[PDB]
């Protein structure tokens, strides 16, 4: 018998991104080669199968720094982290291959699917 | 030039509620008279002006237990915590006054507004 506030989930996500921008209660640093990204573990886990597996591990759940594979492109990771916090994906000809590879690694299927579609359309 | 995944924010919220149900990475207990509720500080802060003020305080941000005013109804708090994590509000004739009072205390304006509307319609 519940009523539902349509904009609630998007407002929560906007507010989580505002906390990230102000560095409020961020609890992990993701390191991608020479670059560092501060984030909230729960948001990473709610978006990515890889982060869900990492932060449910009894030892890794306690880590404050996670180093990604050196093959991962920092710009590709930045674009996906922004997508996690905003639902918006800055997909461009110049970054699509790095974004797709990063989304495969992070196990973000919806992103992998749109990248495949955009690549197929250019063929 | 971004593309947007429409269902992303709702999927994130569903996944945060799945983490709450399994008690994964919950970092605070809210105590309401004899009742305890485990939650994630970032979700509380993203939904409630009161929790935003609490967890941005330099001393209270470190607390693992927060005790609410004894006047707050635990069922009213449970309904609002479920709304935070799902966008669904279980508003009923038998709970509307407790829900409205709890939403005023938690500074959740959209909930206060719908309660006022439902009360006014019954007059």
């Amino acid at each position: 018998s519940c009523i539902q506030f349509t904009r609630h989930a998007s407002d929560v996500l906007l507010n989580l991104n505002r906390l990230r921008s102000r560095d409020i209660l961020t609890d992990v640093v993701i390191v991608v080669s020479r670059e560092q990204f501060r984030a909230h573990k729960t948001v990473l886990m709610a978006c990515s199968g890889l982060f869900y597996s990492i932060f449910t591990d009894q030892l890794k759940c306690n880590l404050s720094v996670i180093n990604l594979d050196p093959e991962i492109n920092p710009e590709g990771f930045c674009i996906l982290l922004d997508f996690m916090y905003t639902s918006r994906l800055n997909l461009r000809e110049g970054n699509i291959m790095a974004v797709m590879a990063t989304a495969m690694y992070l196990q973000m299927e919806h992103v992998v699917d749109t990248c495949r579609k955009f690549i197929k359309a250019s063929e | 030039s971004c593309i947007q995944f429409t269902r992303h924010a709702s999927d994130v919220l569903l996944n945060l509620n799945r983490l709450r149900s399994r008690d994964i990475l919950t970092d605070v207990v809210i105590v309401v008279s004899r009742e305890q509720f485990r939650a994630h500080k970032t979700v509380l802060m993203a939904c409630s002006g009161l929790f935003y003020s609490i967890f941005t305080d330099q001393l209270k941000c470190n607390l693992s237990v927060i005790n609410l005013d004894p006047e707050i109804n635990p069922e009213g708090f449970c309904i609002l915590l479920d709304f935070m994590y799902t966008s669904r509000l279980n508003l009923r004739e038998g709970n509307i006054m407790a829900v409205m009072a709890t939403a005023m205390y938690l500074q959740m304006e959209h909930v206060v507004d719908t309660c006022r509307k439902f009360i006014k319609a019954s007059e």
């Binding site: 519940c2 009523i3 539902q4 506030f5 349509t6 904009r7 | 669904r88 509000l89 959209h110 719908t114």
Partner: peptide
């Protein structure tokens, strides 16, 4: 906003 889901 509010709707019947």
């Amino acid at each position: 906003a509010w709707v019947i889901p």
